[PDB]
Design a protein around this ligand. Structure first.
Ligand SMILES: O=C(CCCN1C[C@@H](c2coc3cc(O)c(C(=O)O)cc23)NN1)Nc1cccc2ccccc12
Length: 282
């Protein structure tokens, strides 16, 4: 009646293939419409054509800074342990969505940005810079002034303290840019990911505002950090559901954004990562 001996420690392609399914039946049934993302006037706001935000969950921008700003951005709200608007899963912005990117951050009061990519990965472009680098002059993205004061550089990730001056108003955002990525079957490379989630949660915990989290397409590594962050936030309150499961968690998280964890490797890391968390703590 109170697992304070969290016995969860106890093939993987099979649980996952079940997630592959579901999201197949979801479409054949026209369950989660992505119509707003298919509008002819947004075709250039999506980094991939087959990765569209669900309407029902899409983040809608109201903050208008021009006679052209629409209410659109590839972004979805992921609920936390207590409710919705806990997480904001998004794609790396494009040259044409930076301003959209910053409006969102601003309109929702986001204080923490976790980017799980590298400008370039494997000789390829994955993200358009939206952040400011120290030493540089300010970088204007429409009416938003992005600056950088300092940045802690750890072994696997960087902490960028950014100063965003919209009008004459100034907010301080914290960018956690995660370069290297620790794959699955390397039970030791996971540690740093927890390093991050703990570090992140050291800046923002019991705060109304969401944590903007994005990788490139906003669904691969982005889901992992959320799923993991979510199980550990549960673990942090022992509120872990009795029948809790890494599968169950990804399932519904996969209800907010299409393919929130797109590879088995990612599915397994999410798993060995929850395991370590429980093994630990105690
Ligand atoms: O094999 C795959 C996935 C292949 C690739 N993906 C990844 C992607 C891809 C390749 O390298 C990447 C590097 C990145 O940094 C990101 C990214 O950040 O957004 C995405 C990719 N393009 N396709 N998976 C499957 C997923 C779900 C269901 C299936 C059912 C049958 C067979 C395969 C399935």
């Amino acid at each position: 009646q109170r697992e304070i001996l969290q016995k969860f420690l106890d093939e993987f392609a099979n649980e996952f293939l079940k997630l592959k399914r579901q999201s197949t039946k979801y479409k054949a049934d026209k369950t989660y419409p992505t119509t707003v993302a298919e509008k002819p006037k947004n075709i250039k706001k999506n980094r991939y054509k087959d990765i569209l935000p669900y309407d029902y969950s899409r983040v809608e921008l109201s903050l208008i800074t021009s006679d052209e700003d629409s209410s659109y951005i590839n972004a979805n709200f992921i609920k936390g342990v207590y409710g919705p608007k806990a997480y904001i899963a998004t794609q790396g912005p494009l040259s044409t969505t930076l301003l959209d990117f910053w409006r969102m951050i601003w309109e929702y009061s986001v204080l923490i940005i976790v980017m799980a990519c590298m400008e370039y990965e494997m000789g390829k472009k994955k993200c358009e810079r939206y952040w400011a680098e120290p030493g540089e002059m300010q970088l204007e993205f429409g009416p938003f002034s992005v600056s950088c004061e300092a940045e802690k550089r750890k072994s696997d990730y960087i902490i960028r303290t950014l100063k965003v001056k919209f009008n004459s108003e100034t907010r301080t955002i914290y960018q956690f840019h995660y370069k290297n990525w620790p794959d699955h079957d390397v039970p030791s490379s996971i540690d740093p990911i927890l390093e991050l989630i703990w570090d992140v949660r050291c800046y923002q915990e019991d705060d109304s505002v969401p944590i903007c989290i994005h990788c490139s397409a906003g669904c691969g590594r982005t889901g992992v950090i959320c799923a993991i962050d979510y199980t550990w936030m549960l673990l942090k309150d022992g509120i872990i559901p009795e029948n809790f499961s890494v599968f169950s968690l990804i399932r519904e998280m996969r209800t907010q954004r299409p393919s929130l964890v797109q590879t088995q490797e990612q599915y397994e890391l999410v798993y060995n990562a929850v395991l370590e968390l429980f093994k630990r703590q105690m």
